[model samples]
Target: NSNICEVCNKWGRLFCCDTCPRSFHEHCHIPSVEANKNPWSCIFCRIKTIQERCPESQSGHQESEVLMRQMLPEEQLKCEFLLLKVYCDSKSCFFASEPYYNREGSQGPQKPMWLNKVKTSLNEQMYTRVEGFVQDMRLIFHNHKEFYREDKFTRLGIQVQDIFEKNFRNIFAIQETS
Candidate 1:
């Protein structure tokens, strides 16, 4: 006889949690349960057990703040850039749209507004230094193909390279000319 899964409220192959009365479809469980793994509990029960073991604390929050304060300005900026890069990468426009020049009727990918803000925040010297860092990393990747696989250096890596290429076109052009 088929029974309604407690998690999805749909009828399917269900497994009952030993710790709780709730029955869940194999796929419906948050963490997911394996057939061989015995004494498994549902997501709710597992979370409850974890919550009981580790309670929230303000001390941890303060400690994190103290640690964050220890980071250098450049390090902090890099972190902020990474966060923005992740946000931009998640958006559909990131991959969906193509880069456009002065060509007519060309609607290129609209850069995220935060990107402009970040660019404006960094000075010329800082930008040059960051660009150099990106170039060195790119050189490393090129020189060591075995160390830096295509999958290993993800969208973030590509985005960082693209940023330097796009922002400092003159630098690259000069290198090409020389």
Candidate 2:
């Protein structure tokens, strides 16, 4: 087999990037090529070139930061504010319904507060950017699904839908321009 990427036609073993659909040879990549690397990713993906990798002080904390940064500045700001509001709301909800929490806790039930906070934050943030993000995510989902089927990431799909609904509600709820 020719040691050339069909997309880039560069030297070394051919490899494809799952994110961008671009092709590159192992040596052509930025992170330096590994010997006998069967399944390789291009530079764009290896370093998450397109998506801004947020600096997180702790593990998993990076998810929120990464997700928020993936959006535009205005969208990100609005989303942060919305998520903050959701967290505040959920806090209030938990405080108000302490009896339920007590009962659930006694029965060794997993606390919903934390997950609810994430869910509410997701919902709130989605409303802020869904108008544009929804369309973009939908297009990306349809296209990438063919290439990345194993990592079907339903959480991302649900997030997109939440954003769309939020945006739809905001658009219709707001007063129309003259």
Candidate 3:
């Protein structure tokens, strides 16, 4: 009674995207489709073309050459998207944790106890009223911080790099020429 992908062992909440045939853990993939029904591409399908060229079997020269090839522009975009999604998720955790901040001197204003209450209220309302708009806004603001703001992004990038390193390490190791 689980929708699970055979290849990655990922579980689907509703079901995998029709195009990819890969299962996603409920919270792993994008939220459930709403009324409009837009199409989606999963993480694997996003890199399918590059993956085909770097099939897991080849070795030595061919494998090295394929690895040497720069990721296609589209592939870079996909990686960026995945990276951004992860960053956004982390940012959501940060916002949900701290809620709001007031800068005073070095310490700044104390965090409010009511922040958690407001967050809970907002989350409940998300189901009935605005849908993902608030969640998406939180994600977008963080995404912007990760992408554009230099100091903030740099600090966050270290953590972001670690996430990618841990998640895609095998792929990176295999790609390395020397």
Candidate 4:
């Protein structure tokens, strides 16, 4: 009795958008949307409302291929490992233990407090916010230095810092010349 559609306002199986707070029945949604898409936008959000150019639309002339080629195999592996570690840690934080045995059976996994801010910045393609996040990550590593005794962590920290610095230079260079 509770599955009311947001679009049609009728009881039916509903799919919710991850980006916006909207839901629709399978038939109510245009193109008959499906679940499982990581981040979905509703019809209203999909419509182009602004003609202004966003920072994300600005193309950078950074030579990514050259930079990638400059990295040694071991360094590349470490970078990938560190990225994976970060992703895993974030997911763990997102799915951390919650107070169960409540009225709603099992609450399943709840989103972490940091998830929305991080997700919003990434979704908006805010490079500066992402850079700040990386800096925070570096600080977290430094604070927990004893936990990461492996040389790989040190290598990864250096590599990420270098990448962020290079990217910042590339982004600012494009902005400055424009």
Candidate 5:
């Protein structure tokens, strides 16, 4: 039902998911959703397929547990969608890779968090709430800040980060002081 591409927040040739209100530009999606694929489901929706076949856990997770397993479908979708949106910025491929992969540094990054790592955590159900996801993302930006230091790299990080914050607010509808 949304008019804009959920990833870019821009108008363009877009594809709708069979099951969610969200839409994406063909290239914005990780695998680049093809126009010919009828009844396309997003990466977010595909997880629900795996989840359904697995059935309910033998140990019931109370509402108070509030793990991702207990998250509302919309909440889960929003979280995953936000993750994709960050990478959809086109400049994310570099940031998504390991920060200090080959070269040694004067000092190593302090608990760096990359987009790929966060995706793994999300799929692994390590996030409990929106706040947890936000914190993990903020860490990525902070690490970028730590490295960039009054340089273009910092600007690049901040640019992607600004988009991340906007999409996050649109999805979660939050103004949490935390």
Candidate 6:
């Protein structure tokens, strides 16, 4: 893959994700990756580990396997850290601000997902479970992708998405597959 970050689209010493053709800046990845001794796996592939960890859980109530309980106290903290990570990313400025929604005469996605909206949802206890939060986080990426071509902007969506996964795994202590 390009030495340029798949997320920020800048040049730097990027880490290669063994499972995918993408590379990332350590700071831009969720759970903030480390360098040497790094047999790092990307977020998309990590799902395999989660699945293997509990194949039975992936069956009935597949989605609900994560459960419908209200967000836990510690989960709330994880969400906070997750949001902070994205907000601090320079590339996230456009997505965080919901640029398209404020267009002079344009409307954005029906739900108008964005970093701030997700942040507010967390504060207002709108998410009953981590699944809901995760879903909304994913929606932001989907919405952004719909409007942007597959360029740096689109890859930024992927970056944010991977970040969410890393933190999601961390929130529940999903076992490492690598």
Which candidate gets the maximum lDDT versus the true structure? 5
For residues 54-96, what per-residue lDDT tens digits would candidate 3 score against the true structure?
Answer: 7752232333343344544542333333333443434334433
Off by over 4 Å in 4: 1-3, 48-178
lDDT, residue 160, model 1 = 50
lDDT, residue 15, candidate 2: 60
Q: What is the TM-score of each candidate against the true structure?
A: 0.31, 0.21, 0.33, 0.26, 0.60, 0.54
lDDT of 2 at 49: 32
The C-alpha stretches of model 2 lying farther than 4 A from their native spots are 1-13, 36-39, 55-178
Give the per-residue lDDT digits (tens) of candidate 5, residues 1-178. 5688876678888888888877878766755586587878886677556456665522333322333334455456667778887887877776786677333443557687888888777767777676677778888888787676666667887888898887765544444343
lDDT per residue (tens digit) for residues 31-57 in model 6: 456556467785544545655777653
**What does the lDDT read for residue 91 in candidate 3?**
36
TM-score, candidate 6, is 0.54
- Order of all candidates by TM-score, from best down to worst? 5, 6, 3, 1, 4, 2
Q: Give the poorly placed runs of model 5, Cα more than 4 Å off.
A: 1-38, 43-70, 101-106, 175-178
Q: Model 1: how far is 87 from its true place, Å?
A: 23
Could you tell me which 10 consecutive residues in candidate 3 have the lowest summed lDDT?
A: 126-135
Q: lDDT at 138 for candidate 3?
A: 35
Model 1, 64-105: lDDT tens per residue? Answer: 233233335433344333323322333313322222234343
Winner on TM-score (1 vs 2)? 1
Poorest stretch of ten by lDDT in candidate 4: 94-103
